[PDB]
């Protein structure tokens, strides 16, 4: 996030980091319960990737991190690789996350919910702070 | 580097899909929602992460970081997967597995 700011550690407890086999963060995701993460289809997640929960300071060695294996990847069949429409994938964890003060789930909306233009929302992540 | 040591956050407004198309044109589909163009921008490495808004006092997943400015311009809206258009699939997938 460009021109964002540091979050309080643990204050976005559903935010996970998706790491490849080397440990390289390549995408974010959101815990929606103890067994499931929602992320973008264009991230191309596989069962060799790992869900990292409870991480907020990659400069810390004292965090209660959970490295969670992925049992199965559920890419939305309607995902369009060219337009990037329907850009959603579900990850089922082989072992459930252990919820804690720093690890818990985001709420999901109803399909009929109206989040109007001008509503102030929040995005979080480990992306670049400057291009 | 421009990689943050610590998780980042930013507040940003939702855009109407008509106003988002003023930037991105026909690339904006019904299953997308735009936000930002307000001084912050999602950028490389934020993909797949959450865009949350309050509903009944609780943070609710409204978007998933999808794509945005080629240079992460903060005067250009970011594009997010519109979860209201995709949550029926999410809930069905959870129920079937």
């Amino acid at each position: 996030i460009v021109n964002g700011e540091e979050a309080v550690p643990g204050s976005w407890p559903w935010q996970v980091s998706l790491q490849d086999k080397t440990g390289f963060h390549f995408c974010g995701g959101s815990l929606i319960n103890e067994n499931w993460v929602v992320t973008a289809a264009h991230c191309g997640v596989t069962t060799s990737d790992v869900v990292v929960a409870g991480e907020f300071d990659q400069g810390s060695s004292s965090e209660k991190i959970q490295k969670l294996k992925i049992a199965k990847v559920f890419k939305n069949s309607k995902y369009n690789s060219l337009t990037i429409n329907n850009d959603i994938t579900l990850l089922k964890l082989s072992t459930a996350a252990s919820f804690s003060q720093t690890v818990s789930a985001v709420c999901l909306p109803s399909a009929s919910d109206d989040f109007a233009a001008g509503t102030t929302c929040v995005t979080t992540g480990w992306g670049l702070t400057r291009y | 580097a421009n990689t943050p040591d610590r998780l980042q956050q930013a507040s940003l407004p939702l855009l109407s899909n008509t106003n988002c198309k003023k930037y991105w044109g026909t690339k904006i589909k019904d299953a997308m929602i735009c936000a930002g163009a307000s001084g912050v921008s999602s950028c490389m490495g934020d993909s797949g992460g959450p865009l949350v808004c309050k509903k009944n006092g609780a943070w609710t997943l409204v978007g998933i970081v999808s794509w945005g400015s080629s240079t992460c311009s903060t005067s250009t809206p970011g594009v997010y997967a519109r979860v209201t258009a995709l949550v029926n699939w999410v809930q069905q997938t959870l129920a079937a597995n």
Partner: peptide, 13 residues
Amino acid sequence: CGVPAIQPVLSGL
């Protein structure tokens, strides 16, 4: 869901 035990603090300067 959606209510962190550690409340986020959004701020600026």
